[PDB]
């Protein structure tokens, strides 16, 4: 099939540039259309930990985008409490099959490093960000500890 031909390359393309942000790439040998990864934030208040993530590809990939879900609780203005995330690049009606997934993830990691309460997905946290960065960071910090994945040593 085509979807697997593309994915097999999309993958090694990413196992090529060892971006220190995303590791370790796991593919479930049940589907291969479902990837797991772990993002390791560079900027506070998310250094204290890391975040697991599942990337599920529709069968009609690459002609229909994937959706990314956070399998780790994260205190973030642009991320659902149920894991859901909104990225411009992988939303339908904005998606071109040529888009390299190495760059959609780069996007996601950039959105976790510098939150954009401009067009948020959680007014709760978004107002706390812009009006009380001290407090917001004080809460995100403790939430990464309590609910976040263990920070990698190498």
């Amino acid at each position: 099939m085509a979807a697997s031909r593309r994915l097999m390359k999309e993958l090694e393309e990413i196992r090529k540039c060892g971006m220190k942000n995303f590791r370790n790439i796991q593919v479930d040998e049940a589907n291969l259309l479902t990837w797991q990864g772990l993002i390791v934030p560079d900027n506070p208040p998310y250094d204290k930990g890391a975040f697991r993530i599942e990337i599920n590809f529709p069968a009609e990939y690459p002609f229909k985008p994937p959706k990314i879900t956070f399998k780790t609780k994260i205190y973030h203005p642009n991320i659902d409490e149920k894991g859901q995330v909104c990225l411009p690049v992988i939303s339908a009606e904005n998606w071109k099959p040529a888009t390299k997934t190495d760059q959609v993830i780069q996007s996601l990691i950039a959105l976790v490093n510098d939150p954009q309460p401009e067009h948020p997905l959680r007014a709760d946290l978004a107002e706390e960000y812009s009006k009380d960065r001290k407090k917001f960071c004080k809460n995100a910090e403790e939430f990464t500890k309590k609910y976040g994945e263990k920070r990698p040593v190498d």
């Binding site: 099939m1 009606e93 998606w95 071109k96 040529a98």
Partner: protein, 609 residues
């Protein structure tokens, strides 16, 4: 005695051989016999008329007078026929093996439907009907022997050491008979002469040189040779006929006109899935024509990409035809109208060139019909189904390339796209609601309640260039007519039926022209229906289906005479409506595409295109 006694005298003579007793020199010697007008099946066991049955081995039937007798489905072995007469005989699928038939008359009846074979036989100085399976016959050297007799009276060509008769004059009827093996269930003089074993290339070529030299003196014009263009190349374009200088010279122009007519027909429309004959005898010529008209590869990319696709996935395509294609394609990708669009990353083997081993690679690059910048990159598995749709065929599985760059197709309607830039798929993207719509009219002609057999059969015959099942037998005459005769009062189109045809196609409150063009097309489809290709045969042709085809044409004319090519062309089509049925079916279609091709592909089965 009478032939009836000659009859019941061989009946129980090959039964003794089938009982053990061998037969002396005198026993197996039935010379000077007379079996005229005797249907041999009646006084013969039902085994000699069955595949892998029994062989009549070791006889001597010299001087026999078979003329008018039926020897159908019977296999002879080791027999003598020298000096017999079989002219006017019926011999559907007959077989003669290791038996010599010198100096005999074999101009059998146009009645016979399947060609008889001649495995290890000799026809030294025999007159033959131009249709015969000689795939085993061992010919002899041409003896000084004088020519066969005649009374003004046509001339004969020599095929090694056999004798073939040219017509009195190449009337369009003479042509479509001897030459067109397409419209004629695979039978023709070209297919007869080439059926000779793969070594007599000397006499095989000679025989064809003698046949072109005949036609060369016909005076017949481009117009009159077109419906046999495809049939001529398919045989004459491959070796050994490539070596022959006299045959290559004449055929050249014929192949330039073939390629041309193919470039007009299938550059906008899906070339129907190829049978074996096509894969073996046609594509190679298309690859050849492309190789000589370099420019064509780009200006008619629509067809090119088809002739290539089908070449690289033809089950029965020779490794030469595949290589030429591959190679012809590396030329096309390097063209400065094509290579700009190549997204060096995703295309082919990601290293610039196609990866022809996989069917799921981005091997194909389609060019826009209108724009210089728009191109489509898609896969073999995908382009295949787009061009041969299924109910679940997805119509967006491709990289839209807008000047080297890829663009989102979400919020781009397929219909709009296919209309503007990629015409090839539109006739196909529609087929799901074009078939239903057509179906709704066949369910109207043939009631599902009472008739269901015919129905699934009319439906079935739509997805194949030809059908094995015919309807010229007597029970299918009374059957059909009882369904068509109510729809055609006084030989005109039933006002009730016509109204149903409109609602069926939503043309009820349409413009008279768009209606005429639709009836014209339905008339064209039901023309096809009553042709050798579908439910008809080479000489017989369902009378109702032809009376319905002509009736639909009527109302077409009645609604808008502008539609037709001329007042007198309507006359002549009408006349021929009353194998001359497959010559109008094409004419009407050639016309249909030139002036209203979007209305045609909405009615005709993509499989018939």
């Amino acid at each position: 005695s009478s032939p009836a006694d000659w009859a019941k005298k061989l009946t129980d003579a090959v039964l003794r051989q089938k009982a053990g007793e061998t037969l002396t020199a005198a026993d197996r010697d039935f010379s000077n016999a007379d079996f005229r007008n005797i249907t041999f099946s009646k006084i013969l066991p039902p085994s000699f008329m069955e595949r892998d049955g029994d062989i009549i081995k070791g006889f001597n039937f010299s001087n026999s007078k078979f003329t008018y007798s039926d020897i159908s489905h019977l296999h002879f072995d080791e027999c003598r026929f020298t000096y017999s007469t079989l002219s006017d005989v019926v011999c559907s699928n007959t077989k003669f093996s290791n038996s010599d038939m010198n100096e005999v008359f074999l101009q059998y009846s146009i009645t016979t439907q399947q060609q008889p074979s001649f495995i290890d036989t000799t026809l030294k100085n025999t007159l033959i009907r131009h249709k015969a399976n000689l795939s085993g016959v061992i010919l002899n050297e041409p003896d000084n022997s004088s020519p066969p007799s005649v009374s003004g009276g046509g001339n004969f060509i020599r095929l090694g050491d056999i004798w073939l008769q040219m017509p009195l004059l190449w009337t369009e009827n003479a042509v479509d008979g001897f030459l067109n093996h397409e419209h004629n269930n695979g039978k023709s003089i070209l297919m007869t002469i080439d059926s000779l074993p793969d070594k007599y290339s000397q006499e095989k070529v000679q025989a064809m040189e003698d046949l072109v030299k005949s036609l060369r003196g016909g005076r017949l014009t481009e117009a009159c040779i077109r419906p046999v263009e495809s049939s001529l190349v398919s045989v004459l374009a491959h070796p050994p006929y490539t070596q022959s200088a006299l045959i290559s010279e004449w055929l050249g122009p014929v192949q330039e006109r073939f390629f041309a007519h193919q470039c007009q027909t299938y550059n906008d429309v899906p070339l129907p899935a190829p049978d074996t004959y096509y894969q073996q005898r046609i594509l190679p010529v298309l690859l050849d024509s492309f190789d000589r008209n370099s420019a064509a590869m780009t200006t008619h990319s629509g067809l090119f990409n088809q002739v290539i696709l089908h070449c690289m996935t033809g089950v029965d395509c020779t490794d030469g035809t595949r290589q030429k294609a591959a190679a012809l394609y590396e030329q096309y990708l390097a063209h400065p109208a094509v290579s700009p669009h190549i997204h060096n990353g995703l295309f082919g083997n990601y290293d610039g060139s196609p990866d022809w081993t996989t069917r799921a690679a981005d091997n194909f690059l389609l060019l826009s019909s209108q724009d210089s910048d728009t191109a489509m990159m898609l896969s073999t598995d995908t382009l295949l189904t787009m061009l041969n749709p299924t109910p679940d065929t997805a119509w967006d599985n491709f990289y839209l390339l807008r000047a080297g760059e890829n663009v989102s197709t979400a919020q781009i309607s397929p219909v709009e796209l296919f209309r503007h830039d990629f015409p090839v798929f539109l006739a196909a993207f529609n087929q799901q609601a074009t078939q239903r719509r057509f179906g709704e009219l066949i369910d109207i002609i043939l009631s599902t309640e009472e008739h269901g057999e015919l129905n699934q059969q009319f439906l079935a015959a739509t997805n194949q260039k030809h059908s094995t099942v015919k309807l010229i037998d007597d029970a299918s005459v009374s059957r059909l007519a009882t369904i068509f005769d109510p729809l055609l009062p006084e030989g005109k189109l039933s006002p009730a039926h016509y109204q149903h045809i409109l609602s069926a196609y939503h043309l009820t409150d349409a413009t008279p022209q768009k209606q005429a063009e639709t009836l014209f097309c339905l008339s064209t489809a039901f023309a096809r229906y009553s042709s050798s290709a579908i439910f008809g045969t080479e000489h017989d042709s369902p009378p109702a289906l032809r009376g319905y085809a002509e009736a639909l044409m009527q109302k077409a004319w009645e609604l808008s005479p502008a539609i037709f090519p001329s007042s007198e062309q309507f006359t002549e089509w009408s006349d021929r409506f009353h194998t001359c049925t497959s010559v109008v079916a094409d004419s009407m279609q050639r016309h249909a595409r030139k002036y209203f091709p979007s209305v045609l592909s909405s009615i005709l089965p993509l499989a018939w295109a």
